[PDB]
Structure 1
Amino acid sequence: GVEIETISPGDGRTFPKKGQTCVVHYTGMLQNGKKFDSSRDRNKPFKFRIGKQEVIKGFEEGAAQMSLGQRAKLTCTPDVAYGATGHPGVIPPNATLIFDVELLNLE
């Protein structure tokens, strides 16, 4: 369950593919809750690649459904990120995730 609500600008044609490393200024948010993660704070914008199951599955499909310069708005289901177990002390079990994601990559 990946729902994209795109803030427009970018190009919409340079899509991420396999074997590519992409750079994201992500921003976490809990539904009816506060912030829990921000790459904007640490100022190291989280270089990662595609297809190695590094990130969660809900964030993985959202990165492929964007392009260079875009600014999406993720909405993930509990079963794709943590909802059975829950990340200990940081994410409660059966939680719904909200993300502000801007992709400014290379490659």
Structure 2
Amino acid sequence: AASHEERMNNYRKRVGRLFMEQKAAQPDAVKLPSGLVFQRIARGSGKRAPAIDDKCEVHYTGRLRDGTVFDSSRERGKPTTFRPNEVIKGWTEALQLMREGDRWRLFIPYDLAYGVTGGGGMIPPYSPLEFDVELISIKDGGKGRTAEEVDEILRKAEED
């Protein structure tokens, strides 16, 4: 029907918004001004976050709001190499706030993920994404923010 696409995407935006809001409501979840939400799973001992162009070794799992896994380095049995500028916006932001050994759960609203069109395959329009992201190591140990810089950004975010 004529208004079918609109109504379906209205449904998608509603349950997607429900997902994001419930995840943000978790007391230890932190919401950044961009809309990115994260939860720390483990605190790493690394001294530096990656710069935007640093190659990172990452173990991750990506799930939809209903738990469906759409991508996972663990199913492949080895980490994947990423630069923060190669991946979706939510990842780009998060990686630059992570140090070696950090493991975070990310809740990424659609506009920082695959947006209105979706990934074109198993990620439909207006999908928030959940990732479990472990930053294993960084080429040359990392050339981005210092741990102290990262922690101060996070501390202020928490307080706002």
| TM bucket, shorter chain | 0.7 to 0.9
Greater helix share, 1 or 2? Answer: 2
Q: What's 1:63 paired with? A: 95
TM-score (normalizing by structure 2): 0.60
Q: What's 2:144 paired with? A: none
In structure 2, what is the Cα distance between the partners aligned to 1:26 and 1:90?
A: 18
Flag structure 1 segments of 5+ consecutive residues without an equivalent.
Answer: none
* Distance apart, 1:64 and its partner CA: 0.8
Q: What's 1:89 paired with? A: 121
Deviates more, 1:2-11 or 1:21-30: 2-11
Flag structure 2 segments of 5+ consecutive residues without an equivalent.
Answer: 1-34, 141-160
- Cα RMSD between the aligned structures? 1.6
**What letter matches 1:103 in structure 2?**
L
How many residues of Structure 1 are paired with residues of Structure 2 in the alignment? 105
Q: In percent, how many aligned pairs have the same letter? A: 47
Runs of 4+ in 1 over 3 A off after TM superposition: none
Q: Deviations over 1:41-67 (max 9, x none)?
A: 11241112233xx21111111111111
In structure 1, what is the Cα distance between the partners aligned to 2:119 and 2:53?
A: 28
Residue correspondence of structure 1 range 1-107 to structure 2 within 5 A = 1-11=35-45, 13-51=47-85, 54-106=86-138, 107=140
Q: Secondary structure at the match of 1:4?
A: strand
In structure 2, what is the Cα distance between the partners aligned to 1:47 and 1:55?
A: 11
TM-score (normalizing by structure 1): 0.87
**What letter matches 1:9 in structure 2?**
R
